[PDB]
Amino acid sequence: SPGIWQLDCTHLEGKVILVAVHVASGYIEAEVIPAETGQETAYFLLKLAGRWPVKTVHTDNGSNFTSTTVKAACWWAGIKQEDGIPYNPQSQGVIESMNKELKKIIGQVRDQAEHLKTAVQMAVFIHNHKRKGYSAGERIVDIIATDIQ
């Protein structure tokens, strides 16, 4: 549970926003990339796993599941690479809702930056700090600290 992350790819302004969600907390990291490639996804996972104890990643699609560069990143970083099949149908809905929420926040901040990447990082900040009560940022730290102890 503490180590499980899900990848998610959404599109805006002709660009791709790649998101990793910590399943148990709803905490996210995200970046803007010109297109989803194996190299972009691999580099993103490398960053993520240096920052959080990433044990398992549910990949966002079959191309990233297949990608030897993504497999190489997962090997390097000690991540178990898994598929992202929603065996629990509620999983689809959760990711869909999150993409809608993120896009809403990006709209609310869009005029506070020229570049989409800046707006996306503002959206990450707002998402992670939002109290729903604890924030996703608080939940992830508590979950992982409990695991360590």
Ligand X SMILES: C=CCN(Cc1ccccc1C(=O)NCC1CCCCC1)Cc1ccc2c(c1C(=O)O)OC[C@H](CCC(=O)O)O2
Binding interface with ligand X (CB under 6 A): 37, 39-40, 42-43, 46, 69, 72-73, 76, 112-115, 117-118
What are the φ/ψ torsions at residue 26 (nearest 5 degrees)? 80, 5
Judged by CB under 8 A, does residue 43 bind its own copies? Answer: yes
Q: How far is the CB of 86 from its own copies (least distance, A)?
A: 27
Bridge-based pairing of strands 15-22 and 27-33 is: antiparallel
| Nearest one of 36, 41, 90 to 70, comparing CA atoms | 41
Q: Is 117 in the site for its own copies (CB under 8 A)?
A: yes
One DSSP character per residue, 43-76 reads: HHHHHHHHHS---EEE-SSHHHHH-HHHHHHHHH
- Report the DSSP beta bridge partners of residue 17: 10, 32
Euclidean distance between CA atoms 120 and 16, whole angstroms: 11
DSSP H or E stretch at residue 13: none
Q: Give the nearer residue to its own copies in terms of CB position, either 9 or 124.
A: 124
Tokens standing for residue 74 = 């997962």
Shortest distance, position 59 Cβ to its own copies, whole Å = 19
| Number of residues lying near its own copies (CB under 8 A) | 29
81 or 128, CB closer to Cl ion? 128
Q: Which of 1, 11, 13, 53 binds its own copies (CB under 8 A)?
A: 53
Query: Which residues lie near Cl ion (CB under 5 A)?
Result: 53, 128, 137
- Residues in contact with its own copies by CB under 8 A are 29, 43, 46-47, 49-53, 76-77, 112, 117-118, 121-122, 124-125, 128-129, 137-138, 141-142, 144-146, 148-149
